[PDB]
């Protein structure tokens, strides 16, 4: 119910002066006189009836003295069951050219976190079909998962295989949010989910909703799409008692986007050129992704590590918010082993003898011990040759090399790259295969038989064919 | 034309206020009431009828309220055929105590670079008599050349050797500009040029002009000398049809002197304390030293690297303005190899089979491959020792160590403090001598016989004496 | 982590004042501070937003004085004052095992010993992974 | 006869190798220390410069 005027335009930060009423912080404003829709968000009160705002789109063509209106509430977006199978914007606008989204409810993207007396204490295992994850770092229902890695190691392929394995066998719904990534991949995912039948253009039996904001957008938009993405999922968790899934691609762009406007807001930089409000801003958002007593949310998040440095302040302050971590490495990928999961740098919270049993626990600890012992023997071999080692050391090295190969596995979404069909392995075969190799029942086979296979039964069938073709 | 008043003096920056007739940028101004001429240059228009200037001399004794007069044009210097054999300074005043310089016309320091349609694209070769340069990274005619090196490694000895070998036989004129160096070296150069005969004091047969501003001058002067040399270099190219050689000593001081005044002008420093405008003002100066459809200019420049660092912002932006590079190393100089030229870090633009011929190119690529291979065995030799290598590796080590010695050479300008005799090798003898070593014809000689000699025939005789 | 910075800056003193009640009445107590680094980060944020001069790694000049006051309130009293006690066990996390950063060097210089834990000893079977070579109590 | 000479030569070789390694690890430490100081000075200058321009 108030009207203002633009008095300054610098970069992506705008200042507005009000003569009648002063809108509160975290309010939405609309500019008058443009062919498209431009929205401003309040950040600070500068005194003398002035505010400093951040734009959600391009700012070219603005003129000092242009009228601005006040909406009177934070950003509101449609929500409900009519947003399944549709693509929407940061501010809730369809971008798939199929007409308006007709719902009955709206929600505000700025809320507050649940309190202490609403948390849940439950832990159950969630099997996926991947040997490394199911052996050394199991996942849990209603938990938080992180996928650390550098550039070009395989985060996106893994997050696609997780969807293909877990999402389709799930009763409930799912949400996917894309933050600061390539548009070309967002064109691929949309047409992949149509062939599989998860998204339907004729019936009303869809199961996924999509929200997108990519790396061609100004920093204002890239720092808000995640809240829009999780506001949708909160509706399916609270207003309906159902389990939900939530996938996020490169949550790192949420933090980088906030460092490109801090200087223009008048702030002194912190270490390595970050804003002084990093941890608080990260904590405010992360606390809303939880499984309260009214519903469950299972989240998978992909995190980018700049220049393969795990001590950087952005990934450093993210380990505390998770329940299970998988770390991808470039050294393993150069040997040709995929997925390039580091076996000595992954952790989980339910790796306890009282939750997964004793056999499963002993097998994993026995694998890790021999993998650690392998490293120390590689210093001796550098100076004195391979043949001067004792026979026990040679047996240790031979077993360790075979253990290393058996952790690789062909995926189903990577048939174009490798050229093989994918495989899925249950948990009991995963335990038994490593227990047998640790025992020493396959000391009469070459290494190549354990490379890119599924269960243990296929390695001997591969070795027999290799013997036949020799 | 108009008069102003001095309002503030800080270091080498002075501000003047004009009642009427505000001067434009790059004009010169004169101070009233001093024994020696003092000139200021306009740099900025602040507002409220005030300007900010830069002085070209010391500013001690100035008082607020003093009078400043306007001239109406940029700095002008005498240019023509009567500057040969004389010595000038920043603002074109003679410092050789021989009277005024009587030329017909004058020229302004600041101008603009040649346009795109005036460029020439011919390429040839220039022979220097030095084995490393001719074999690995040959020079060219009408091109730019740079010499990189730290402190105490020998840039100016090489510049004087190049002067001695090339300048004397040249038919055209030459210009030497000295920026930020020692004065005694300039005095030595003047006296030895008098003795040789390049400078003649009793007639009009001189073929060199000298411009100097040394390291005892305020930073305002040292930021402007190179353009004073450039102007007299360009006159002989445009008005007359001549080939000109231009030697500039430590063009790095042109950049350093510009950052001593950037803070006083009120700017935000960019990186390692340098001024934000570092590449544009270097590009403005460098683009004028070119070859056009009216003449040719050959440039030889010496460059300095602070704290033996090649990634410093100052010498890392000069690589893009050169056609041939020569990099000097302190580690090679420690081993006693002179000149200390790094053979795996020097390039040239005309090293291709269709210009220098097939045989020369094959020999150069073979010697570079042999040199590269020996560098990859250093870690094993430094710990385990020579005995762990096979026979072929020992053979490659011996041949590379023999090749390294043969690249050194004695200079004539260093005979006074080395007790040797200067040498000058033709190109064919170098090509053949390196072919013969690559073929293994001299595997029965000690490696100490290829040290500080000229043509290959001197190695066998020194080996024969050293039985 | 969802609370404001001043609460995360006030939390340890409030817990020390509760334990000082037992020390003055002839009883014994024990207090554990988890993640003393995050209190220093919370304190740095306010000082950067209040326009105070920064220093090494953007920390203020009185960060040592912030932690020296807290850890000097653990003591053993004699018989005239009752004979109480108070013991503290602060915790600090390092990056890549670097013990020459700004905050660990401050905290190491105040206390009376350290217990060093490593990850190489964790995966070769030595659990708990205590390194006896670099541990001491004066 | 041959075995004893082989052993007595291997001992000397293994002594000289450790001498060379001890020689290398002494220059690398000084280089490391200089770089460590330079990084701190460079990262402090940026904070000061970005605080002054406000």
């Amino acid at each position: 119910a108030a009207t203002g005027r633009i008095v300054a335009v610098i970069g992506a930060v705008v200042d507005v002066q009000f003569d009648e009423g002063l809108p509160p912080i975290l309010n939405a404003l609309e500019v008058q006189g443009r062919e498209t829709r431009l929205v401003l968000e309040v950040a600070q009160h500068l005194g003398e009836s002035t505010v400093r705002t951040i734009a959600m789109d391009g700012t070219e063509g603005l003129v000092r003295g242009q009228k601005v209106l006040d909406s009177g509430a934070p950003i509101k977006i449609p929500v409900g069951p009519e947003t399944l199978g549709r693509i929407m914007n940061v501010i809730g606008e369809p971008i798939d050219e199929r007409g308006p989204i007709k719902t009955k409810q709206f929600a505000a993207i700025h809320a507050e976190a649940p309190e202490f007396m609403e948390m849940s204490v439950e832990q159950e295992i969630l099997v996926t079909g991947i040997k490394v994850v199911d052996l050394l770092a199991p996942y849990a229902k209603g938990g938080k998962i992180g996928l650390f890695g550098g550039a070009g190691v395989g985060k996106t392929v893994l997050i696609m295989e997780l969807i293909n394995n877990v999402a389709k066998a799930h009763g409930g719904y799912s949400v996917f949010a894309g933050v600061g990534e390539r548009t070309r991949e967002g064109n691929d995912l949309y047409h992949e989910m149509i062939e599989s039948g998860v998204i339907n253009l004729k019936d009303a039996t869809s199961k996924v909703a999509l929200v997108y904001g990519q790396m061609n957008e100004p920093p204002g938009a890239r720092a808000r799409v995640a809240l829009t993405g999780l506001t949708v999922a909160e509706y399916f968790r609270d207003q309906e008692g159902q389990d939900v899934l939530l996938f996020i691609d490169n949550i790192f762009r949420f933090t980088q986007a906030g460092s490109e406007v801090s200087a223009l807001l008048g702030r002194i930089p912190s270490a390595v050129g970050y804003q002084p409000t990093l941890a608080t801003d990260m904590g405010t958002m992360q606390e809303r992704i939880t499984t309260t007593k009214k519903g469950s949310i299972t989240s998978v998040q992909a995190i980018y590590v700049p220049a393969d440095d795990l001590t950087d302040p952005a990934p450093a302050t993210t380990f505390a918010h998770l329940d299970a971590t998988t770390v991808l490495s470039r050294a393993i990928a150069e040997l040709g082993i995929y997925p390039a999961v580091d076996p000595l740098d992954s952790t989980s919270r339910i790796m306890d003898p009282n939750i997964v049993g004793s056999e499963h626990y002993d097998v994993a600890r026995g694998v890790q011990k021999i993998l650690q012992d392998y490293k120390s023997l590689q210093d001796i071999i550098a100076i004195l040759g391979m043949d001067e080692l004792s026979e026990e050391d040679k047996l240790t090295v031979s077993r360790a090399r075979k253990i290393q190969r058996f952790l690789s596995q062909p995926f189903q979404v990577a048939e174009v790259f490798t050229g093989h069909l994918g495989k899925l392995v249950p948990l009991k075969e995963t335990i038994k295969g490593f227990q047998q190799i640790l025992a020493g029942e396959y000391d009469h086979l070459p290494e190549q038989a354990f490379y890119m296979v599924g269960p243990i039964e296929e390695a001997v069938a591969k070795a027999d064919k290799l013997a036949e073709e020799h | 034309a108009a008069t102003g008043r001095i309002v503030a003096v800080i270091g080498a920056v002075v501000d003047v206020q004009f009642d009427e007739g505000l001067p434009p940028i790059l004009n010169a101004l004169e101070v009233q009431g001093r024994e020696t001429r003092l000139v200021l240059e306009v740099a900025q228009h602040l507002g409220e009828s005030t300007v900010r200037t830069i002085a070209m001399d010391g500013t001690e004794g100035l008082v607020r309220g003093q009078k400043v007069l306007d001239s109406g044009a940029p700095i002008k210097i005498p240019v023509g055929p009567e500057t040969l054999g004389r010595i000038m300074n920043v603002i074109g005043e003679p410092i050789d105590e021989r009277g005024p310089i009587k030329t017909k016309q004058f020229a302004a320091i600041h101008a603009e670079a040649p346009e795109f349609m005036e460029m020439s694209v011919e390429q040839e070769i220039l022979v220097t008599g030095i084995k490393v340069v001719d074999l690995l990274a040959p020079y060219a005619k009408g091109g730019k050349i740079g010499l990189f090196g730290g402190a105490g490694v020998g840039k100016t000895v090489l510049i004087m050797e190049l002067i001695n070998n090339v300048a004397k036989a040249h038919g055209g004129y030459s210009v030497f500009a000295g920026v930020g160096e020692r004065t005694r070296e300039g005095n030595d150069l003047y006296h030895e040029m008098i003795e040789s005969g390049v400078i003649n004091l009793k007639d009009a047969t001189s073929k060199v002009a000298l411009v100097y501003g040394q390291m005892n001058e305020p930073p305002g002067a040292r930021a402007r000398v190179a353009l004073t040399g450039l102007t007299v270099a360009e006159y002989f190219r445009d008005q007359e049809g001549q080939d000109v050689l231009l030697f500039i000593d430590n063009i790095f001081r042109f950049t350093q002197a510009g950052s001593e005044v950037s803070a006083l002008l009120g700017r935000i420093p960019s990186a390692v304390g340098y001024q934000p405008t570092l590449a544009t003002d270097m590009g403005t100066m460098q683009e004028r030293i070119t070859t056009t459809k009216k003449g040719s200019i050959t440039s030889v420049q010496a460059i300095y690297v602070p704290a033996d660092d090649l990634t410093d912002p100052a010498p890392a932006t000069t690589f893009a303005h050169l056609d041939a590079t020569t990099v000097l190393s302190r580690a090679i100089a420690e081993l006693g190899i002179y000149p200390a030229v790094d053979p795996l870090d020097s390039t040239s633009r005309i090293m291709d089979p269709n210009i220098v011929g097939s045989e020369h190119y094959d020999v150069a690529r073979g010697v570079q491959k042999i040199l590269q291979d020996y560098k990859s065995l250093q870690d094993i030799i430094a710990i385990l020792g020579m005995d762990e290598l096979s026979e072929e590796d020992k053979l490659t080590v011996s041949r590379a160590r023999k090749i390294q010695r043969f690249l050194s050479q004695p200079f004539q300008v260093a005979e006074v403090f080395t007790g040797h005799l200067g040498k000058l090798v033709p190109l064919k003898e170098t090509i053949k001598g390196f072919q013969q070593i690559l073929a293994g014809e001299y595997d029965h000689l000690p490696e100490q016989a290829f040290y500080m000699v000229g043509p290959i025939e001197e190695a066998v005789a020194k080996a024969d004496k050293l039985a | 982590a969802s609370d404001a910075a001043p609460l995360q800056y006030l939390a340890p003193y409030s817990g020390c004042s509760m334990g000082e009640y037992f020390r003055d009445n002839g009883k014994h107590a024990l207090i554990i501070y988890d993640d003393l680094s995050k209190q220093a980060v919370a304190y740095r944020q306010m000082s950067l937003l209040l326009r105070r001069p920064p220093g090494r790694e953007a920390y203020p000049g009185d960060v040592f004085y912030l932690h020296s006051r807290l850890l000097e309130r653990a003591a053993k009293m004699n018989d005239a004052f009752g004979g109480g006690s108070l013991t503290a066990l602060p915790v600090i996390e390092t990056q890549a095992g670097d013990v020459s950063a700004y905050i660990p060097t401050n905290v190491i210089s105040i206390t009376d010993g350290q217990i060093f834990l490593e990850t190489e000893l964790f995966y070769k079977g030595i659990r708990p992974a205590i390194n006896v070579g670099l541990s001491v109590s004066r | 006869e041959s075995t004893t000479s082989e052993q007595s030569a291997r001992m000397t070789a293994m002594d000289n190798a450790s001498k060379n390694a001890s020689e290398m690890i002494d220059k690398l430490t000084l280089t490391f220390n200089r770089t460590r100081q330079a990084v701190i000075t460079k990262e402090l200058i940026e904070i000061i410069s970005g605080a002054a321009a406000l």
């Binding site: 120390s376 590689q378 210093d379 550098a382 | 990859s376 | 020459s100 190489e120 | 490391f32």
Partner: peptide, 25 residues
């Protein structure tokens, strides 16, 4: 504690001559 302390597998992490020599054997 203040100095540089090495660990296990540091020879093959630097990727010098000795690492590749170790791998090929």
């Amino acid at each position: 504690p203040e100095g540089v302390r090495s660990g296990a597998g540091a020879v093959r992490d630097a990727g010098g001559a000795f690492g590749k020599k170790e791998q090929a054997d």
